[PDB]
């Protein structure tokens, strides 16, 4: 029962890390999507220097 | 001796003529080429803009 209870604790560890895993996903996309706004940041950057 | 100073007149007219279409003409000449290489020179600005 003590092994079941130590377990329980890790369990409690892995629900820790599967939100943290699915927090890492949720922010890397973010991270993509901030690289192509900065793209968009940059072509609007571009033509009015062109303009 | 009024005929003789016309006689100077027709040069003035001769010259001036002369003086007058070659160079409008030629003015076009130049004239042409103004626009030829501006719009080489806008695609020539937006190349390396756009790369």
């Given at each position: 029962?003590?092994?079941?209870?130590?377990?329980?604790?890790?369990?409690?560890?892995?629900?820790?890390?599967?939100?943290?895993?699915?927090?890492?996903?949720?922010?890397?996309?973010?991270?993509?999507?901030?690289?192509?706004?900065?793209?968009?940041?940059?072509?609007?950057?571009?033509?009015?220097?062109?303009? | 001796?009024?005929?003789?100073?016309?006689?100077?007149?027709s040069?003035?007219?001769?010259?001036?003529?002369?003086?007058?279409?070659?160079?409008?003409?030629?003015?076009?000449?130049?004239?042409?080429?103004?626009?030829?290489?501006?719009?080489?020179?806008?695609?020539?600005?937006?190349?390396?803009l756009?790369?």
């Amino acid at each position: 029962a003590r092994l079941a209870d130590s377990s329980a604790q890790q369990k409690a560890v892995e629900r820790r890390a599967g939100d943290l895993n699915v927090a890492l996903e949720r922010a890397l996309d973010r991270i993509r999507a901030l690289e192509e706004e900065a793209d968009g940041l940059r072509q609007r950057h571009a033509g009015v220097d062109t303009a | 001796l009024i005929q003789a100073e016309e006689r100077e007149v027709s040069a003035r007219l001769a010259a001036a003529e002369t003086a007058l279409g070659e160079s409008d003409a030629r003015r076009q000449t130049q004239d042409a080429a103004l626009e030829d290489n501006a719009l080489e020179i806008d695609r020539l600005r937006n190349a390396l803009l756009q790369s």
